[PDB]
Design a protein around this ligand. Structure first.
Ligand SMILES: [Zn+2]
Length: 108
């Protein structure tokens, strides 16, 4: 469909849709300055994704989104590294989980 964001490598596999896109705030209380950490402008954040295999267990090592652990996520079909599943380290956070997907790994 027109909303469909698919793996660039295998083409047919849908990973997420435009409907699931949201904007995660990268600042803390009062929206202070933060030192940029990783490469967020290159990464699309969605609530929900599909047809990915998670590799390994969540890690908090040098997370691009502090407060979240990351788990590598690759396409089930072709095993291309599409991005990561992010999981909250604290129960009071929202969302408790999301996906950070590398924009260039997706079509469109
Ligand atoms: Zn693929």
């Amino acid at each position: 469909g027109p909303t469909s964001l698919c793996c660039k490598q295998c083409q047919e596999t849908e990973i997420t849709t435009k409907n699931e896109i949201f904007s995660l705030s990268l600042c803390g209380p009062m929206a202070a300055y933060v030192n940029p950490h990783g490469y967020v402008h290159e990464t699309l954040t969605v609530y929900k994704a599909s047809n990915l295999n998670l590799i390994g267990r969540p890690s908090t090592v040098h997370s691009w989104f502090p407060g979240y652990a990351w788990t590598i996520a690759q396409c089930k079909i072709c095993a291309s590294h599409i991005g990561w599943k992010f999981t909250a380290t604290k129960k009071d956070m929202s969302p408790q989980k999301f996906w950070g997907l590398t924009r260039s790994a997706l079509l469109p």
